Amino acid sequence: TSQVRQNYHQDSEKAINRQIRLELYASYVYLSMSYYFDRDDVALKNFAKYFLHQSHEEREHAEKLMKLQNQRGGRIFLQDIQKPDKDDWESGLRAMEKALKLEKKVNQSLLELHKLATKKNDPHLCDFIETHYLNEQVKAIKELGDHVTNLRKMGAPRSGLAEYLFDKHTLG
């Protein structure tokens, strides 16, 4: 047992390791999406910039969980980071829809992790998830839904003019 460990359940420790993997997976998906928009046959520089920003943010989400693991005296165990489900993300609209799906899946995992922290009477871990992750997820999901709504209303993905103008005026 780590000299620092106190009120830290082994189940919570294993769950935090799985959350670190999910955050690194989310970073990877956003990295894939970013460079799709950098393609010469897609060429939406602000979609590329937006998703690269998201990719770097997911890496910081992972690093903060790795810090928490060591803070509580847990031990980090890393697994392969799986490739994203798509190589070609089709359109700005379809990428935003897939990003919204991703953020809701990450959110579901955080809520399962909170339920487990609640069941193991770990208020420090409850506070950590609430303070640093749950509202970040709500804001992310709201923002992506807003993006999806505007792109659909403007006539995306059939209107290449819609994706062009959204890229300039919302993401730029």
Tell me if 150 contacts its own copies by CB under 8 A.
Answer: yes
Contacts of 167 (CB under 8 A, 6+ apart): 44, 45, 46, 47, 92
Pick the closer one to its own copies by CB: 11 or 80.
80
Q: Which C-beta is closer to its own copies: that of 11 or that of 39?
A: 39
Q: Is 158 an interacting residue with respect to its own copies (CB under 8 A)?
A: no
Annotation: binding site:
23, 58, 61, 103, 137
14: partner contacted, choices its own copies, Fe ion, none (Cβ within 5-8 A by kind): none
Residue 135 contacts its own copies per CB under 8 A:
yes
Other beta carbons less than 10 A from residue 130's beta carbon = 14
Q: Using CA atoms, how far apart are residues 42 and 162, in angstroms rounded to an integer?
A: 13
Distances (CA, A) of 42 to 15, 33, 36, 39: 38, 11, 7, 5
Which residues carry a binding-site annotation for Fe cation? 23, 58, 61, 103, 137
Find where tokens 């998830």 sit: 129
Q: Report if residue 61 touches Fe ion, rule: CB under 5 A.
A: yes
Of 10, 7, 8, 15, nearest to 114 by C-alpha is 15
Joined tokens for residue 12: 């919570």
85 lies in the site for its own copies, by CB under 8 A: no
Nearer CB in complex with its own copies: 10/70: 70
Residues 8-27 that bind Fe ion (CB under 5 A): 23
> Is residue 121 a contact residue for its own copies (CB under 8 A)?
yes
**Cis ω before 123 (30° cut-off from 0):** no
For residue 2, the minimal CB distance to its own copies (Å) is: 6
Q: Which does 1 bind (CB under 5 to 8 A by kind): its own copies, Fe ion, none?
A: none
List of residues contacting Fe ion (CB under 5 A): 23, 58, 61
